[PDB]
Amino acid sequence: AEPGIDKLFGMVDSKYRLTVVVAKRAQQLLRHGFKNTVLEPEERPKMQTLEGLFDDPNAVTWAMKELLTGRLVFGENLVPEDRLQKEMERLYP
Amino acid sequence: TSVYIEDVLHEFSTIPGVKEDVVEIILNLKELVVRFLNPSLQTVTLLLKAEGPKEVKARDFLPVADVEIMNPDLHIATLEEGGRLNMEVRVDRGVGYVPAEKHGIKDRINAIPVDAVFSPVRRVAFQVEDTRLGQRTDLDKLTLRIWTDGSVTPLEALNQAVEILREHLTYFSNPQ
C-alpha cells in the first residue's frame, strides 16, 4: 500500500477531500518550480542506483509526504482566490 | 550458431535430391558436439558438402586442426542422387541457452541463426549417503555423478563450477 495512507484519511473530513488536496499541492510543486517543499532537509524521498530522487521524482509522491507532517494547513476558504499564483510566483523563481 | 546453405533462402525450405528438409537437418546440427583445444578458438566455422547416395555423417566434415568433433555417427541428413549439399556451419563457445532471435548471427546475407546448446551437462545428481569412517554415525559421504556431451570431461566441469563458486565468495567484501 501507500505510505501512511491511513494517517492521511484521518486528517481529512472526507476521503475525496484528500485527493483534491494531494493533487493541488502536487502541481504547485512542479509548475511553481520544484523547491516549494517543506521536508527537504532530511528524510527526503530518494531513488535507487543514484539517490538523485532529491530533486524531481514524482509529484504526488511528495505531496503526501508533505502532509505526513502537520506543517501545512488546508481548508475551504483559507487564502484569497487570485492572491494564490501571485504570492507564489513572486516568492519562488 | 548459424548456417548458410547455397540453394536456400529461408530455414523453411527444402533442397532437391535432399531427403530431410531444412528444419530437419538444422535440428540434427545443434545435436552436434565439438571440442576446442585452445582459449583462442572463440569462433570457428566448418564446412562440408557431399553428393550422390550416402549418409551425411558429421564426421564427413573437413577437419580444422585444433577443434575436434566428438559426435561422429550423428546422422544429419541423406542425399538421394546428386544432392546439392552446401552449407556454412558457424560454431561458437558461449554459455548456456541463447535464443536464435536474440543474438541474430549474420555470417551471410541469407543465413539463418540458431539456438545455443552449450552447457556440456546432460544431467547431474547428488547422493548424501551415510558415513563410512569416524566414531560418529551422523556424518555424510557426498557423491555426485555427472554426464557431459563430450566437450569438457566431468573433472573439467567440476573444477570450473567449484571455482566460479570461490570467486563469488569474495564479492562479500566491501560492506556498506
Binding site: - | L9, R122, V128
Partner: protein
C-alpha cells in the same frame, strides 16, 4: 518402441470411411462415375425427370446427361481464386404436335463444383464445407393438443419448402379442422372434393367412432360432388372468379407441393408404417379425369378416430424421436438446390414457346445457363450451410467435415424454439455423440454424428448391432433404424463372454431406450462396441471412463484447436483410432499398391509397382493452411524399399508413423509450486524450449491488388514518392519483395502508386517464402472487374512457446503458461532427470477428470519400459494390469541403481519417514520395498533442485500428453500511446504503423464513476479522444515536462450548444446566479 493394447472385446467390423458421409453422398447424387447407361435415378437424373417433361405445342424431354471436364486442376484453383467446377452439358430433343423434328444439339448449362479427395470443396480459391442438417422427415404425425389435455392433433408436412403445412385439429365444439395457410375449414368439404360420399364415408369411417357425426354432418353442401371444389375455392381469401381456376387445388396434386420424394421410402415410410397402407403415386395426388383420389385423407383421419377412441396400437408419435427425424446430406442439399434451378429453367422454356417463332427453334431458344448456374453458385457460396473449412489441423477439418446442425432453410428448425431438441434425447444413443456439441450459445443445436453410425437411404442415422440367438453371440450385424431398434432388446458389449455364448445370468441390457436387467434368454441383440457410442472427436480420449461428460466435452473440442507442432509425437496412450484417422483424413499419403521405392526426394516420391508400372507423387512441402499453419509431408521411407499396398509414404501435418500426434508427451510432476501454477497456470522447464519440443510453423497471407481508379490507375513498382532507398533494398523486383527476405514491422513488401504500398502491418511478418502476381494477360484467371492486376505475399515464422502460451490435455484441462523455470532449479528425480512440466493438483478435484491421473501413471511406466500403449474407450486397461507392468518398471529405475553400487539416499529416508506417518507405506518393511510399494502408487521421491532439499511426500509423475492451441499471443499485443485518428469522428484508430486503443464502454465508465475519479474519467472522455485541442495541448505539456492540460470545455460541449442553436433551440448557458456565461 513396444506396443501393448488391452483389447478384450473382439472388435468385429472395422470403422467405416469416416468421410463416406460426404463421399458417397455426392457420388450417388450426381451419377457420373458410370455412363447414362447405368440409369440410376435419385439426385441429378431424378431432378431431370422431375421438371424436364415440359408441355405448355412445347414438347421437349430429357435424353442423356454427361460432363465432368474440370478446367483447371486442384491447386490451380486455390491459388488462382478459381472455382473448381465442371462443364455441364445436356442432350435433349424436341417433338411437335405436328409429327416431325428431332433436334438434339448438345446443350450445356453452367458448371458444377466437385468434391475433393478429402471430401471438401474449392469454391472461390478457398476450401469450404457442406455440413449436414437435421429436421423432421416430412410425413404424417400425431401429437397431443396444445394447452388442452383434451384430444390430440394430426400433422402433415411434405417438403421441399414449397410444401403446404396441412394440419388436422379435432375441434370439440363440432367438426374436424384442417389448418392451411392460417385458415380452418370443414375437412368434409374437401373429402367431398375427393369423391367421398356421405354414406360410403361414414360407414367405413366412424363405424367405431361415434364422433363421426362431426363430419357426416354436411347434408346441405356434402350433397354436391364436383361442385364442392367450386365452394372449396370460395374458402380461399382471394376474390377470384368461381370458374375452373382450380389452381391452388391442382397445386396440391402431383406437381411440386406434395413431396415428390421417393415412391417407396421417403414418403411411403411415414405412410404404410404409421397409417394407411400402400402409396398411390408419390403423394396425395391424382388430378386426372376431373375427380381426385387420395388414399391419404381416409387414413390420416382413420388414425385420428383411432387414438381418440379404442387402442388400435397407442399411436402418440414422439417429436425428438430420431425415428422420424431425417438428415440432409450433401447430395440431398445439392440436388435440392439443383431442382430449384431446374424449375427456374423450365420457367423460361415455357414462356419461350408462347412467343416462339414456329418450329424454327429448339436448343438455345429454349435454353439458358443463367437460371441454372445462378442457383448452384448461390448454394455453394451464399448458403449458410457451406462454411470455411476448419483446417486448424488434420483432425479439426475432419470433424467440421462430418458435423451436423438443425438450423438451415428455416422450414425445418428456427432459432427461438428448440430448448427441447437441444437436450440429448433417448434416441440419440449411438446416433449423435452426446459430448460433441460446441460451447457457448447454440450448444446442442450443432453436434457431429456418432462413430460407426452411418446415414441410410434417407437420413435416419442407423447403427450397428450384434445379433444373438438365445445365449449365443452372432458374428453378423445390421444397421438398425432408430425406430425398429426399440422393437428388440439389446444388451451391452461389457457382458462377459465365453467364446460365443453369454456369461452370467444377470445381464445388463437396454429395452426400449430404457436401462433394464434381462436374462441370457431374451437376448435379441448386443452392442457392437463402446466406440459406436461416441464420435471420433471423443474416441480419442485416454480413459474417458474416468472423466465427466462436461469436462470431456472440453478436451474433445480442444483437440480440434490443436496446432501442428513441428516435432509430432503420438500420445503415450492411444484409443487405437489414430491409425485410421490419419488415413480417412488424408493428412498423409499411402502407397496405391505393392512394389518398391524409387525416388525418395524431399519434394518428390517415385515408386515402381510390381504390376509393371511407375508413378511419382507431389510432395506438398509447406502449404499455407486455412488457419495459418504448416502442412508438410515428411517422407518416412528410404530409396529402394519393398513396400506394401497402403503403406506410410510421408507423414501428415500432425501425423507420425501412421499415428496421429497432435502435441507431445512430456514428463509431468503434478504438484503445487511457488504459486506459479495458481488458478490454471502451468509452469515449465526451459529444457523443453531447448530441444525445440513445443513449437510450430505459422504463415501470413497478405494480398494486394492494383486497383484501377478513374483518377489514374495504381501502378506496381519500386517507385516511392519519398525517395526512400533504405527500404528499396529488399524490394528487388519491380514492386514485389525478394524471396527469403526478412521483413520487419513497417517495411514495404509491395509498392503501390497514385504511395499506397502494402507495408508490414503491426506486430510482425516473418520470412517470405513464396509470392506470385497476375498481370493483365490473364492466362486463365477471373480477374475481378476494376482490377488491372493482383499480387500475393506468403510470409511465415516459427512459433516458439514463450510466456503467453496456453496448452491443454485430451481430458479438458486447459491452462496458460506462467513462468518457465530453467532445468537448473527444476524439481528433479533422486537420480538426475529433472521434471518437465508442473501441474497444480487443485485443478483435479473440482474437475472430476481422473483420466489424466491414469494416463500419467501408465506413462510413468512407459518411460522406463520404453513403450506406448493403446487403451480402448471403456474396454481400456484396468488398475490391476497396470500395477503389474509399473512394478516391472521399478526393477529398471531402481534395479540399475543396485548393480551400479549405490543404495538409498539420506534424503529418501526422511521422505519415506513421513510416508509411513501418512499411511502411504507399510511400516516395518525395508527401504527397498517401501520405495517399490510406493512406486506402484505412481509417486516417487523428488528433490527440489533449487535448494536440493527433496519435497517431503512422493509426487505422482508420468508422461502426460499436452498440446498448444490456435489461440496464440500474436493476435493479442496492443500497445498504443500516440497515433492516427478516426478520419470521420475523432478516435485513436491505428491499423498501419501504430495501433488502436481498446474501447472503454459505458460499463467501465460506470465503475470509474463509482470510484469518484472525476478527473481520471473526464480524462478518458476528452483528452484521450474527442477534443483534439486538449490532446495535443497535453502532448506538449508532457514532452515539456509540464502538468497535463485541463480541458476547459470538451469539443462535444460547445459543438452541441451551437448544434442546437442551428435549429431554434436558444441554448443559453447561465451561471450560478442566473447570469450569462461566455462559451467560446
Amino acid at each position: 518402441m513396444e506396443i501393448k493394447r488391452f483389447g478384450r472385446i473382439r472388435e468385429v467390423i472395422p470403422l467405416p470411411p469416416l468421410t463416406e458421409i460426404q463421399v458417397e453422398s455426392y457420388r450417388r447424387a450426381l451419377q457420373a462415375d458410370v455412363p447414362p447407361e447405368k440409369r440410376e435415378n435419385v439426385g441429378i437424373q431424378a431432378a431431370f425427370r422431375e421438371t424436364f417433361p415440359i408441355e405448355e405445342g412445347l414438347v421437349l424431354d430429357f435424353l442423356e446427361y454427361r460432363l465432368g471436364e474440370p478446367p483447371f486442376p486442384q491447386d490451380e484453383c486455390r491459388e488462382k481464386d478459381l472455382t473448381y467446377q465442371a462443364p455441364l452439358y445436356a442432350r435433349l430433343q424436341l417433338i411437335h404436335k405436328d409429327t416431325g423434328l428431332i433436334k438434339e444439339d448438345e446443350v450445356f448449362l453452367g458448371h458444377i463444383p466437385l468434391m475433393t479427395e478429402d471430401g471438401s470443396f474449392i469454391i472461390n480459391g478457398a476450401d469450404r464445407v457442406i455440413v449436414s442438417q437435421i429436421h423432421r422427415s416430412p410425413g404424417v404425425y400425431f401429437t397431443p393438443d396444445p394447452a388442452r389435455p383434451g384430444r390430440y392433433i394430426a400433422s402433415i408436412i411434405p417438403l421441399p419448402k414449397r410444401g403446404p403445412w396441412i394440419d388436422l385439429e379435432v375441434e370439440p365444439n363440432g367438426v374436424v379442422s384442417m389448418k392451411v395457410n392460417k385458415r380452418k375449414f370443414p375437412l368434409v368439404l374437401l373429402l367431398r372434393v375427393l369423391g367421398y360420399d356421405q354414406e360410403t364415408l361414414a360407414r367405413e369411417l366412424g363405424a367405431y367412432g361415434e364422433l363421426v357425426q362431426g363430419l357426416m354432418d354436411e347434408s346441405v353442401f356434402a350433397m354436391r360432388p364436383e361442385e364442392a371444389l367450386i365452394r372449396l375455392f370460395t374458402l380461399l381469401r382471394p376474390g377470384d372468379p368461381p370458374k375452373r381456376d382450380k389452381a391452388v387445388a391442382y397445386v396440391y396434386g402431383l406437381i411440386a407441393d406434395p413431396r415428390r420424394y421417393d415412391l417407396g421410402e421417403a414418403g411411403r415410410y411415414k405412410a404404410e408404417e404409421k397409417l394407411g397402407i400402400r402409396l398411390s403415386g408419390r403423394t396425395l395426388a391424382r388430378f386426372e379425369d376431373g375427380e381426385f383420389k387420395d388414399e391419404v385423407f381416409l387414413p390420416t383421419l382413420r388414425y385420428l378416430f383411432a387414438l381418440t377412441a379404442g387402442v388400435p396400437g397407442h399411436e402418440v408419435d414422439d417429436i425428438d424421436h430420431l425415428g422420424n427425424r431425417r438428415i440432409r446430406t450433401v447430395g440431398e442439399l445439392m440436388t435440392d438446390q439443383f431442382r430449384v434451378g431446374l424449375a427456374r429453367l423450365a420457367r423460361g422454356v415455357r414462356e419461350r414457346m408462347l412467343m416462339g417463332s414456329e418450329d424454327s427453334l429448339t436448343p438455345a431458344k429454349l435454353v439458358n445457363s443463367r437460371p441454372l448456374e445462378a442457383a448452384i453458385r448461390e448454394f455453394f457460396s451464399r448458403s449458410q450451410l457451406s462454411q470455411f473449412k476448419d483446417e486448424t489441423n488434420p483432425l479439426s477439418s475432419l470433424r467440421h467435415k462430418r458435423r451436423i446442425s438443425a438450423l438451415g432453410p428455416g422450414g425445418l428448425t428456427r432459432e427461438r424454439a428448440g430448448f427441447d431438441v437441444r437436450d440429448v434425447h433417448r434416441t440419440h444413443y449411438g446416433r449423435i455423440c452426446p459430448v460433441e456439441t460446441p460451447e457457448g450459445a447454440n450448444i446442442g443445436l450443432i453436434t457431429s454424428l456418432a462413430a460407426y453410425a452411418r446415414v441410410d437411404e434417407l437420413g435416419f442415422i442407423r447403427t450397428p448391432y450384434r445379433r444373438v440367438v438365445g445365449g449365443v453371440v452372432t458374428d453378423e450385424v445390421v444397421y438398425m433404424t432408430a425406430t425398429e431398434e426399440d422393437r428388440y432388446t439389446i444388451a451391452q458389449a461389457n457382458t462377459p463372454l465365453e467364446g460365443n455364448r453369454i456369461a452370467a445370468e444377470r445381464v445388463v441390457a437396454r429395452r426400449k431406450g430404457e436401462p433394464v436387467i434381462v436374462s441370457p434368454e431374451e437376448v435379441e441383440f448386443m452392442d457392437v462396441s463402446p466406440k459406436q457410442v461416441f464420435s471420433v472427436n471423443t474416441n480419442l480420449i485416454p480413459f474417458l471412463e474416468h472423466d465427466d461428460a462436461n469436462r470431456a466435452l472440453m478436451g474433445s473440442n480442444m483437440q480440434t484447436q490443436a496446432v501442428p507442432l513441428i516435432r509430432a509425437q503420438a500420445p503415450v496412450v492411444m484409443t487405437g483410432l489414430e491409425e485410421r484417422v490419419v488415413r480417412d483424413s488424408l493428412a498423409a499419403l499411402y502407397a496405391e499398391e505393392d512394389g518398391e521405392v524409387a525416388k525418395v526426394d524431399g519434394n518428390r516420391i517415385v515408386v515402381r509397382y510390381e504390376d509393371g508400372r511407375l508413378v511419382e507423387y507431389p510432395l506438398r512441402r509447406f502449404y499455407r493452411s486455412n488457419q495459418g499453419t504448416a502442412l508438410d509431408q515428411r517422407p518416412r521411407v528410404v530409396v529402394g524399399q519393398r513396400v506394401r499396398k497402403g503403406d506410410l509414404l510421408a507423414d501428415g501435418p500432425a501425423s507420425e508413423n501412421g499415428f496421429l500426434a497432435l502435441g507431445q508427451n512430456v514428463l509431468v510432476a503434478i504438484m503445487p509450486f511457488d504459486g506459479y501454477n495458481f488458478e490454471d497456470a502451468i509452469v515449465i522447464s526451459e529444457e523443453l524450449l531447448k530441444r525445440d519440443f513445443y513449437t510450430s510453423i505459422h504463415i501470413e497471407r497478405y494480398e494486394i491488388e492494383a486497383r484501377d481508379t478513374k483518377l489514374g490507375p495504381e501502378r506496381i513498382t519500386r517507385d516511392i514518392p519519398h525517395l526512400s532507398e533504405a527500404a528499396l533494398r529488399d524490394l528487388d523486383e519491380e514492386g514485389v519483395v525478394r524471396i527469403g527476405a526478412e521483413v520487419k514491422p513497417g517495411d514495404i513488401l509491395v509498392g503501390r502508386t497514385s504511395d499506397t504500398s502494402l507495408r508490414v502491418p503491426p506486430g510482425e511478418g516473418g520470412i517470405v517464402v513464396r509470392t506470385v502476381r497476375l498481370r493483365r494477360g490473364d492466362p486463365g484467371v477471373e480477374l475481378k472487374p476494376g482490377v488491372r492486376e493482383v499480387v500475393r505475399v506468403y510470409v511465415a515464422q516459427k512459433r516458439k512457446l514463450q510466456v503467453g502460451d496456453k496448452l491443454a490435455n485430451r481430458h479438458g484441462n486447459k491452462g496458460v503458461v506462467a513462468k518457465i523455470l530453467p532445468v537448473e532449479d527444476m524439481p528433479h528425480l533422486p537420480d538426475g532427470t529433472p521434471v518437465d512440466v508442473i501441474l497444480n493438483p487443485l485443478g483435479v478435484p473440482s474437475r472430476m477428470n481422473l483420466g489424466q491421473i491414469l494416463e500419467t501413471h501408465l506413462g510413468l511406466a512407459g518411460y522406463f519400459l520404453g513403450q506406448r500403449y493403446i487403451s480402448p474407450i471403456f474396454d481400456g486397461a484396468k488398475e490391476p494390469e497396470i500395477k503389474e507392468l509399473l512394478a516391472q518398471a521399478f526393477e529398471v529405475y531402481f534395479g540399475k541403481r543396485k548393480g551400479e553400487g549405490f543404495g538409498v539416499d539420506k534424503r529418501e529416508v526422511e521422505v519415506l519417514r513421513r510416508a509411513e506417518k501418512l499411511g502411504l507405506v507399510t511400516p516395518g518393511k525395508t527401504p527397498e520395498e517401501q520405495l517399490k510399494e510406493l512406486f506402484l502408487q505412481g509417486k516417487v521421491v523428488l528433490y527440489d533442485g533449487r535448494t536440493g532439499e527433496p519435497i517431503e511426500g512422493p509426487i505422482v509423475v508420468g508422461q502426460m500428453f499436452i498440446m498448444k492451441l490456435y489461440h496464440m499471443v500474436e493476435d493479442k499485443m496492443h500497445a498504443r500511446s500516440t497515433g492516427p485518428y478516426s478520419l470521420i469522428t475523432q478516435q485513436p484508430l491505428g491499423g498501419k504503423a501504430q495501433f488502436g486503443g481498446q474501447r472503454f464502454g459505458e460499463m467501465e465508465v460506470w465503475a470509474l464513476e463509482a470510484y469518484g475519479a472525476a478527473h481520471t474519467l473526464q480524462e478518458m472522455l476528452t483528452l484521450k479522444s474527442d477534443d483534439i485541442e486538449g490532446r495535443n495541448a497535453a502532448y506538449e505539456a508532457i514532452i515539456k515536462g509540464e502538468d497535463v492540460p485541463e480541458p476547459s470545455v470538451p469539443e462535444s460541449f460547445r459543438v452541441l450548444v451551437k448544434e442546437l442553436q442551428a435549429l431554434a433551440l436558444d441554448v443559453q448557458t447561465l451561471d450560478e446566479k442566473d447570469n450569462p456565461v461566455d462559451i467560446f
